[PDB]
Amino acid sequence: IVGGTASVRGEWPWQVTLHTTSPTQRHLCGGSIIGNQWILTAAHCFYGVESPKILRVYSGILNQSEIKEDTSFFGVQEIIIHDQYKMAESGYDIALLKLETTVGYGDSQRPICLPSKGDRNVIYTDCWVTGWGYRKLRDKIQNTLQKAKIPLVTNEECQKRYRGHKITHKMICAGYREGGKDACKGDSGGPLSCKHNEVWHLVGITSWGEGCAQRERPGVYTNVVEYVDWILEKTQAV
Ligand SMILES: COC(=O)Nc1ccc2c(c1)NC(=O)CCCC[C@H](NC(=O)/C=C/c1cc(Cl)ccc1-n1cnnn1)c1nc-2c[nH]1
Numbered sequence: 001i002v003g004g005t006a007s008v009r010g011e012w013p014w015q016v017t018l019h020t021t022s023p024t025q026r027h028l029c030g031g032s033i034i035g036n037q038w039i040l041t042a043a044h045c046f047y048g049v050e051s052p053k054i055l056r057v058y059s060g061i062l063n064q065s066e067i068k069e070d071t072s073f074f075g076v077q078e079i080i081i082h083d084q085y086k087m088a089e090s091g092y093d094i095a096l097l098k099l100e101t102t103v104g105y106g107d108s109q110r111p112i113c114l115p116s117k118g119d120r121n122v123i124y125t126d127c128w129v130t131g132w133g134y135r136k137l138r139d140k141i142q143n144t145l146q147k148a149k150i151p152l153v154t155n156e157e158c159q160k161r162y163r164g165h166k167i168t169h170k171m172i173c174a175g176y177r178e179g180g181k182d183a184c185k186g187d188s189g190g191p192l193s194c195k196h197n198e199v200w201h202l203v204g205i206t207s208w209g210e211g212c213a214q215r216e217r218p219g220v221y222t223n224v225v226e227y228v229d230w231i232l233e234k235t236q237a238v
């Protein structure tokens with residue numbers, strides 16, 4: 001996260017750190033708890049991930065230093081990538097992790113509500129991007145979870161900012177015209193959380209941008225409201 005500040009413990013209890021174990025253990029991506037055995041994240045996080053056996057989901061983490069060999073995690077039973085996914089820049093950048101065991105909800109770990117299909121028209125004015133990602137292009141994963149408040153950008157304005165790309169309504173953009181605050185390397189897969197009527201909603205999934213926090217280059221997020229039926233298809237299968 002660029003231009004962000006340290007989160008407080010329990011502030012974003014749906015935020016997870018997804019680690020890979022191959023060749024050595026390290027943070028791979030962010031993710032969000034959306035159900036008691038479900039993590040919503042970005043499809044591009046699994047580039048070159050041949051098996052769910054190398055994945056570890058850690059919830060209730062503020063500091064990466066809380067994670068050692070003796071730290072409990074959730075194993076991943078299954079990786080579900082959207083069928084239409086090709087690359088982050090073309091959209092459908094969404095995946096679900098079915099966990100091997102159930103998350104016990106509490107003040108340190110609980111789900112974030114999915115946006116309502118009826119609320120596709122609501123204007124979100126209190127949106128925050130969170131993660132342990134870089135503070136600038138050439139940096140390192142941060143110990144403490146960071147947060148940055150960022151305004152949503154219309155599809156029309158985002159399309160003007162990305163000449164040569166096709167910014168669809170299945171993407172949602174966020175950033176200041178002047179730049180300064182954004183997601184960066186290591187934040188992808190994490191949430192873009194917006195508070196509306198005292199309830200937090202998972203509005204976006206950190207996906208891509210041209211550089212980090214650049215002037216007139218908003219961050220591009222998967223527009224979660226457009227995938228609510230796909231999520232229910234995969235999580236509520238009979
Ligand atoms: C010690 O552990 C370690 O260093 N781990 C570690 C470090 C870095 C990584 C990573 C793991 N994950 C990946 O490479 C897979 C995942 C690969 C893509 C991922 N993309 C982002 O996270 C976000 C991009 C992004 C999103 C928005 Cl909204 C705006 C600007 C963006 N950027 C443009 N340029 N940079 N960012 C990434 N992640 C990493 C490097 N790239």
